[PDB]
Amino acid sequence: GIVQQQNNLLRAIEAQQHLLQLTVWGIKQLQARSRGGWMEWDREINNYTSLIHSLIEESQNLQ
Amino acid sequence: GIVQQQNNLLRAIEAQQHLLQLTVWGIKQLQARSRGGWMEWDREINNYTSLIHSLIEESQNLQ
Amino acid sequence: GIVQQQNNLLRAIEAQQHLLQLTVWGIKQLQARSRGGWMEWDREINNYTSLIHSLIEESQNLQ
Structure with a gap:
């Protein structure tokens, strides 16, 4: 799903x-x-x- | 939302x-x-x- | 669309x-x-x- 694909993209990042x-x-x-x-x-x-660290922690909170 | 998470993924990239x-x-x-x-x-x-530059500018236009 | 933007994010990755x-x-x-x-x-x-390789091949299969 869109949600699963999104979580995988973040994990790759x-x-x-x-x-x-x-x-x-x-x-x-x-x-x-x-x-x-x-x-x-x-x-x-x-x-x-x-910067990258803050965007990641943010995405993690957006999951 | 899905849209917000997507914009954040691009920003990290x-x-x-x-x-x-x-x-x-x-x-x-x-x-x-x-x-x-x-x-x-x-x-x-x-x-x-x-290549990366073109994919990014493309994603920016897909936002 | 959400699907197109997602495929582009993976391609950039x-x-x-x-x-x-x-x-x-x-x-x-x-x-x-x-x-x-x-x-x-x-x-x-x-x-x-x-690890990255496995997440990518996974995302490719999630497309």
Whole structure:
């Protein structure tokens, strides 16, 4: 049903957010090994991560 | 409602696309510092990015 | 319609999964060039990738 398909879409989105955070973590480990000017990059990652987190928790409450 | 949940799912997808582009940018900065054979990788990233962009703009028009 | 918007959301999710796998591949190529302790990272990437894959194939069957 429409409701079931919707819950599955959210679950996929939550699963991809996990993968996305794993790639962010990985990239940071790589940079650390060495641009030094990652300040803005970090800010953007943090802002969008917080954003995604709030949209997800919202969708979870909309289920 | 079904309509509200749907708009929120799209918003999460748009937010994750932003994060995804940030990780792509980051990876490129890392490679640049140094496989040289990233030609295909770049092509694939570009094709899927353009693809995702068109699906999003489409969903936005389907709202 | 609700059904069309839903199919488009899934398509965007499938397209982003492709991009996500491309960034994972890229990160691995970068690490390979050099933390050595990526064991857990690999396990997590694999578990969530398999997970995302099953949710997608499921959604495809829910269409």
